[PDB]
Design a protein around this ligand. Structure first.
Ligand SMILES: OC[C@H]1O[C@@H](O[C@H]2[C@H](O)[C@@H](O)[C@H](O[C@H]3[C@H](O)[C@@H](O)[C@H](O[C@H]4[C@H](O)[C@@H](O)[C@H](O)O[C@@H]4CO)O[C@@H]3CO)O[C@@H]2CO)[C@H](O)[C@@H](O)[C@@H]1O
Ligand SMILES: [Ca+2]
Length: 179
């Protein structure tokens, strides 16, 4: 049930248009019974723990669910960029593991070198009641990200795959952007 973006004028995924802005379970995901929807102007990913998408290690993110913006219909020039950052939102401080594989027309895949984790102690309470952590993926963590960001001949991200793991059946991603 992924839904195309209605407004991507910010140049990054802010999920403020009520859509999953192209995101949904990836065809090659080992896990599929994961819910991906828009809630509270964010990308809400439910049941990660119940479906075994809870690997929190650095190199076994292969066991986690893979999501991708297959019906995104947009793109982002990332030449010269060095980071992929996003806010992880949850009602209580949880643990979330994220590995990413940005894709371009000529650089379709690269095995992530490592997944980046934010642990409970990384979450800060928000006045809205929820807790939020800032997760950042460097080009050092994703070779395909480094390849695209350093390839002036083809530095346009046309899609992306995220490996998402958590010990919480309720987390949200928001403001996923390259900088
Ligand atoms: O073709 C246009 C279409 O492409 C979509 O992207 C595809 C990639 O093109 C495709 O290469 C990629 O395939 C992955 C596959 O999903 C992985 O599961 C698999 O992983 C391998 C790993 O590479 C090996 O090193 C390791 O030893 O084993 C694992 C599995 O055992 O690797 C292949 C790549 O070789 O899948 C993408 C989609 O999931 C774009 O997303 C889309 O936008 C384009 O339209
Ligand atoms: Ca938002």
């Amino acid at each position: 049930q992924p839904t195309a973006p209605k407004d991507f004028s910010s140049g990054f995924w802010d999920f403020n248009d009520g859509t999953t802005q192209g995101f949904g379970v990836n065809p090659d995901s080992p896990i599929t019974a994961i819910n991906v929807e828009n809630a509270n102007n964010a990308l809400k990913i439910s049941n990660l723990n119940s479906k075994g998408s809870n690997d929190l290690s650095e190199g076994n993110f292969w066991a986690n669910v893979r999501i991708s913006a297959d019906i995104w219909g947009q793109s982002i020039n990332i030449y010269g960029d060095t980071k992929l950052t996003m806010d992880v939102i949850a009602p209580t401080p949880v643990n979330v593991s994220i590995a990413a594989i940005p894709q371009s027309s000529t650089h379709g895949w690269g095995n992530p070198t490592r997944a980046i984790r934010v642990w409970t102690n990384n979450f800060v309470a928000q006045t809205d009641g929820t807790y939020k952590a800032t997760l950042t993926i460097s080009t050092n963590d994703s070779p395909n990200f480094n390849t695209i960001a350093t390839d002036a001949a083809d530095s346009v991200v046309t899609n992306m795959i995220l490996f998402v793991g958590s010990n919480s059946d309720n987390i949200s991603l928001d403001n996923i952007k390259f900088t």
